[PDB]
Amino acid sequence: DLSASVPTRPAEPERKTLADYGGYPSALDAVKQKNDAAVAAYLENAGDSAMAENVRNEWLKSLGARRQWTLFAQEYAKLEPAGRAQEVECYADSSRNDYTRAAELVKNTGKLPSGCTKLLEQAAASGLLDGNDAWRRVRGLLAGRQTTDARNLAAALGSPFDGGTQGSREYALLNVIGKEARKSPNAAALLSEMESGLSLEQRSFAWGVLGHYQSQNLNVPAALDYYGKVADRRQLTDDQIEWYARAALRARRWDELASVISHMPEKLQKSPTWLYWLARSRAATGNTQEAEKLYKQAAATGRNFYAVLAGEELGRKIDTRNNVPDAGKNSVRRMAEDGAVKRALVLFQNSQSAGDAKMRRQAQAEWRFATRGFDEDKLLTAAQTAFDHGFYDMAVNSAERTDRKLNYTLRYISPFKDTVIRHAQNVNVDPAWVYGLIRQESRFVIGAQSRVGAQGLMQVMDAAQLYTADGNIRMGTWYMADTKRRLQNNEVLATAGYNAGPGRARRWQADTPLEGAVYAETIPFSETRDYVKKVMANAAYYAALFGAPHIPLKQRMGIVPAR
């Protein structure tokens, strides 16, 4: 059952909501201009909104950088803890000389916000960083071309890049681990020579860089050779070790894959991906009981790609029956009366009738803010509220945030159904697949617009039709079908091709057939890799809702042909 409880935060007039949005972009500009007066002014009589919270966060990032600690302390105190930006959090801790966050932040080997980067430097100088993690971050930054951040961190650790000790040596290793040097045919040879004057840690990292590059280029034998020389796998960045795993996966080396996963950070080990592939590994080596236990863990992570695959290895097929009742109409009407939710519905209403894309995005921001910390019943109530106002993406996003209470008709909405079904049938493609793609591409926002310039529901006679929902869907489905036809009629390749181009999709094929999930998990582009898994997962959910003949997701993924 569902609770009818809804929040009752103070509601402002529509005119105030709109008046305050009127000044929102200027407030952000003032932050950028360092006009503290303007900002303070915007905030002093602002609603308790995402608008105020965003301005306050960006302001605090600015204030922290400029070392205006008095004003910082004052405004930081006005933020909701759940609403603080990571970097603002780092600035605040550094101002209190509290380096508690450093133990976890230092495990990140990539670019961090400036406040977070400086917190690690200060912690380093205070002898508060674990030496192993600290130097691993220095290498990661070096290998990721963040040379300045690597410099400063090495300096802060007491061994700068021109000091004759470790720092100078780590810097020196760029002849091997540089972004361009790693691609050299003699990178391996060069490392092999100087290996003698290298620490265990340095050697492991360097071989990881070489194997990572080969692996992400889908040169599997070479990758596994280089990775094979890594003595301490825990020295690897998260991307390096995942690509080690990906190489072992693609080569079907189950014993090595299991071994590699066992050396991952615990948080990586516990992701749906490596829960599943470790279970497959166990299953493939005869350790059934251990496999079954891991499939159970994986299935429990939610509605995602690997959770479904793991469910199928347990004989459990997807079931889209709701395990909760519909939200009651009275609840839904009352949820809309809440001040935070109303402010979101107001900005979203007015962005439609004013055609303001930016106002719509702030309405999304207000929705996230309004529903932050909602229990599952309120989430499900707010999801129907969004749906009723045509705020389709927030309907989906609210509904999918529950863990135990499942409304599949709100998680997998299907507006425009007579239009989508028709266009899909006209070019001979699965409607479930089409809905699956739309849900991922645009979250059913008819006006949706990518940075790359992709347009409409499908993020793609007269050409202008592209911008109407009928024309967009017509073109998207045609291109889905055409791309599929160009890629040996395979739906996994088509999905990758839709996102990255059919040239790339074909380039990622092996010279032997690949299991679909294996092709998908080893896609070199992280955005495309994630896209394919979500689209195909979505599709399996839509097929169930549509009452189509049951097709396991593992079967949907099928076999990707050799090229």
Numbering used by the authors: 41 to 500, 514 to 616
Anything the authors wrote about it?
Lytic transglycosylases (LTs) degrade peptidoglycan (PG) to produce N-acetylglucosamine (GlcNAc)−1,6-anhydro-N-acetylmuramic acid (MurNAc)-peptide (G-anhM-peptide), a key cytotoxic elicitor of harmful innate immune responses. The crystal structure of the outer membrane lipoprotein LtgA, a homolog of Slt70 that belongs to family 1A of GH family 23 from the pathogenic Neisseria species, was previously determined at a resolution of 1.4 Å..
This represents a newly identified conformational state of LtgA whereby alpha helix 30 transitions from an ordered to a disordered state. Interestingly, this disorder of alpha helix 30 did not affect the overall structural integrity of the active site because all the other helices making up the catalytic domain remained intact. Moreover, LtgA was already shown to be active in the crystalline state in our previous studies, although the molecular details of alpha helix 30 interactions with the ligand was not addressed. In this study, we identified a variant of LtgA with a disordered active site alpha helix 30, which is important for PG binding and for the catalytic mechanism of LtgA. When LtgA, missing the alpha helix 30 motif, was expressed from an ectopic locus in N. meningitidis (at an elevated level compared to wild type), bacterial growth, cell division and daughter cell separation were disrupted, compromising the integrity of the cell wall and PG composition, and diminishing bacterial fitness or virulence in a mouse infection model. In our ΔltgAltgAΔ30 strain, we observed significant defects in growth, cell division, cell separation, cell membrane irregularities, and fibrous and membranous extra cellular material, which were noticeably absent in the wild type, ΔltgA, and the ΔltgAltgA strains.
